[model samples]
Target: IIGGDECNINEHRFLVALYTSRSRTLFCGGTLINQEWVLTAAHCDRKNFRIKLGMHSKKVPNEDEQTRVPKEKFFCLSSKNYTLWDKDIMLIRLDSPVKNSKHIAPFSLPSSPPSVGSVCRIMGWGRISPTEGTYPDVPHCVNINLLEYEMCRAPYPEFELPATSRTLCAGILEGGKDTCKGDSGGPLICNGQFQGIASWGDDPCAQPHKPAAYTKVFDHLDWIENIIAGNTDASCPP
Candidate 1:
């Protein structure tokens, strides 16, 4: 979010912030896919965190805001040994359903990934600079485009970078803006659809020719639906 505009809460109602229950630290971001479910990265699946919705300013709590804890969590990949960069998606069932309002709602999931070169926007409350570790009190957003797998893999050939079928690459090639630390699990929306989840990227924030990776939402729709429908073998404790 180095060179992006501040986001309006009314415009991004589905946006969510994950906060540590004790320090109230805004650790990660998430999206409300439904009244009772949130989509985020599994790596953000830590304990002692609460979900906050309809809040534009992290420091100034909105009266319309709703907060809750997880009743249970279901990972896109069942394995606990899965790497943070691969199959990093997760769905969190809220302890109670959020009442939908002008400032609180769910984002529509995409049926498939956007085509290469498709323009999109990534929003988050992450760091504003690579050098400084401070996160913005208000969320910021920047326009990016979907890129081909090869183009995404082109930057780092030294080792496996976790860009796979389950993930998609996005960023401004010219460089300037990109998601940073504390932005993981945020939304990458295209054409008003929830297409990707903020996953990982380079260390120094946005760099020339290096695109950030996101968990492709379309690929896991069925798995998400099944869990929501209570068709999965896993069950949450009351």
Candidate 2:
């Protein structure tokens, strides 16, 4: 949270911390969809990365904590340039299933999209500010309202199309609260169901009416089930 700055760790159990090293750190977040799968952003990871589940504190990890490497990674495909944010979503198969516990569990994908203006829950270990040192030691939580596709384009007049069919946007329309670095790939849960993946928006945090765009999860549910069912080749329709 940049403008709205709130500091409270959530009781969420499906959070997956994606980091580059074993020193207990995170640059992005993921949602544990099941025992063996994680749903996230297509641009969230490098070719190979590790995901840690069942933890609130990123700096301190239990000696027995469980972590997973990718068994396979799947991303949405499009002929158009992805830099424009086309289908910015992805799913990874965990090397092994996580054991369920009080601290760890899985989140379910949405049966249908949440209505516009629905307030959604966003959780991550992202920064309190845009600067590098503003990152918190524990994950933080915030609530943002979903915005219409037409309303999300005002912030990006430079793009030919700022919001694509595969993308949706959310946040306080007036821009007092929103996501930032280390928040990308995090889950946007609406009514306890997975709806969006934190993708991109104003660089320096909350800016007036600049709602951040997210990867629309409902539109890719079929591909997600296919990937989790062992179809690594699954992708968006051409």
Candidate 3:
């Protein structure tokens, strides 16, 4: 499950990896939305963090080309059930704006939410399987089907974590597909626009059609703007 094909950041320059320095291993994903800011999941916010770009293979880095840097991290302070992942997005401000290059550039955010049934692509370097050696040498991505909020939550009535406007769901019912642990904070793009930030889903990823939830970026535009206005404040959004 969580199958995908290898790709390059030359195609998705904004995609970045979040990991611990001790492990230096890829654990989460993020989108470079501007010269100085990265958008990702609130949970992916971590200590001793840095971002990497122009990275195709986490295992084999193009040291000369890869751009890695420790940056100021910020989280959204929307009070809610953290257990339920409300307002699950965060922004990271790079110590210095990244120099625009062919191999690394920022993604454009979307102004509208996608309609149900829209197909989108998820890009990350997460595991292809639970097996120990499933991690890909190159970045991987797969197409997912976006669903209406109600239809997407149909399978998780048991969880009872009702969907809120701040979130949306997308994936397939067909088994063996989707983002896994390492894909968190990755972009969910529809029509080539940033639409969602990879959040969470059922465990044992891609289990029989369990669609994953994404932080709906559109709903929090004003909040994001506040952050951007603060000279792209490297602080949490209120």
Candidate 4:
């Protein structure tokens, strides 16, 4: 419904379902960085993981007519160990390339960081309420305006404020709506640019007096570009 009739076959292109071999649990969410690459949260990684692209409903992959791009290679951020949250990002190279379609296309990554107070949109198969479980098979999206650093930092003096350089903070101050657990690794787009990756957050979705956070995509542009270009140390200009 977000993109109209084109949503049927290509709706799965921008999404991916992550599976963990250890727990045998399934996690939903992913970003289609390219025809053969999916950007997702590092926390989703586990042995024998697979990235399923071009599928609408994770509950019933066969019901959707979208194509599936399996993982050919999995790459974790090599600069830091698993403990560091700053480098909690991962990439999956698809085993084969997918032909582009109206609904299947690479999203535009932001070239630079976004300014505070900018309006952005978050998309995912997450739930509207933590108690309600994941939303129906259809993908859902919401608009959130970025909050200023000082405002977002005020309530959490004990914890480091999500900085503009590494993380993005958004959602209503009073908390009307937001992304939840199942939405991790989803895409947050702003002004036609991919700006953030769903990461972690506190409290329940749409709960009053709660805030949600996401991985700042603009802050990792250099690392993302380098990986996409097959380079290890390409410098990113601030």
Candidate 5:
């Protein structure tokens, strides 16, 4: 569904749009960390991908509109050696620095990552249901608490949980509220800090007992830090 006014700020900022060629559609959501960098899922890096920062609505690209934000440079996340879940994080660098506003402030990246049972927020433009059709307007945001590995792994046996220092899990234990299709690459923020990137989840918009999964940002802090620092060669533990 679309984001409501609750997350929208007057001088609102901290949002990005992931554009895809096949659909030529713009997926809107929030930015997790710095304006120069964003925290989103890996799948959003599909063909013909571009990022727009500092905007509200995806429909208008002109600077005259209230939602108009500057279009930024796009980069590809090489996931050739990793699975969709494993290589689920991507970054976007802006050509120019963005001026912070009430609605457009940058989110803090956690220096010390959270543990199981930590709380987090997941925001996006996900549909209420797959059959019901897409959300008709702007994107929306919601919050979900972090789930312990024991709970996440028990239900998602086929999917691998974050074990290395760079990953973590958050969502419903029984699976009801979560980010769905079209919500990929969104931010999983908490306490004014970003902890995860919206990645994957069981389809159908919060199916029974199926929780949404995300890429743990805290685990890859060094890699992300290096990328923004202009040292792209820093490697993350698999």
Candidate 6:
């Protein structure tokens, strides 16, 4: 959430905060895709965690906040070998379907990815800076531009295949404006549609010429729907 401003709760009702069940420390952000599922980065996956939905402030619980846990049944990721530079998206089945409220609902997945260079908004409760790691009270959001694949992948020469058709790159290439640590699984919205899920980015984020990378939501619609429909092989234990 670096270089961003506190956001309105209404604008981000689909947002959810992932916290450690024991210590209750906020570690990742996620999006409520439906009453029973949440979309996030696979790297944020955990065996035990609590999800806080309909939240705006991280410290004080919102009046509409609803707390939930994983179903303890099953969840799914994009691949068996998802990496930061590859498939990093995931979906978790909620223990129970959350009832819709004025401040809680699911986001609509994009039918197609926004064109490169389109202006978009990304929201999260991640660290505001690299060295300082305190969680902000309220969620923050920033205006950013989608970056071309080549321009976004150039900085990381080690990543021979840093992106795919299902990946998106975005930020202020000049730096100082990008998703930071603890923001994994946040939402990227463009044209009022859910476009991306924060996957990974430059180390010490907001680095010069290094835009953040995301798992393009639109490209995974089929897989998402299939899994939600119970069409996938079991990956979790009974």
Highest TM-score model number: 1
1-238: candidate 5 lDDT, tens digit per residue? 3222234533235556666545647764546366556666555655455555555555644352222222332223444334534656666665455666544657778877676666676665567554467653455666677776445565667765545323455666555677766777777776556777776676666655566667777777777777778786667655
Q: By the TM-score metric, which is better: model 1 or model 6?
A: 1
lDDT of 6 at 123: 89
Q: Candidate 2 residues 33-66, lDDT tens each?
A: 8889998887886855788888776657644468
Could you say which candidate leads in lDDT?
A: 1
lDDT of all predictions: 0.82, 0.77, 0.75, 0.61, 0.59, 0.81
Model 3 Cα lDDT, one tens digit per residue, 120-146: 889888877833447777778888888
Clashing pairs in 3: 173-209
Of the two candidates 1 and 4, the one with more favorable lDDT, higher being better, is: 1
Candidate number that wins on TM-score, 1 or 4:
1
Worst 10 residues of 2 by lDDT: 1-10
Tell me the spans in candidate 1 whose CA falls farther than 4 Å from its real position.
Answer: 161-164, 234-238
Give the Å error, residue 103, model 4: 3.9
Question: How close is every model to the real structure, measured as TM-score?
Answer: 0.92, 0.90, 0.88, 0.77, 0.78, 0.91
Candidate 4 lDDT over residue span 163-219, tens digit each: 443557677776666777667778777666777777666655665545556667777
Better by TM-score, candidate 3 or 2: 2
Clash-forming residue pairs, model 2: none
- Better candidate by lDDT, 3 or 4: 3
Query: Which parts of model 6 are misplaced by more than 4 Å?
Result: 72-80, 162-165, 234-238
- What digit string (tens of lDDT, one per residue) describes model 1 on residues 102-143? 789999778765787788888888898965887788999888
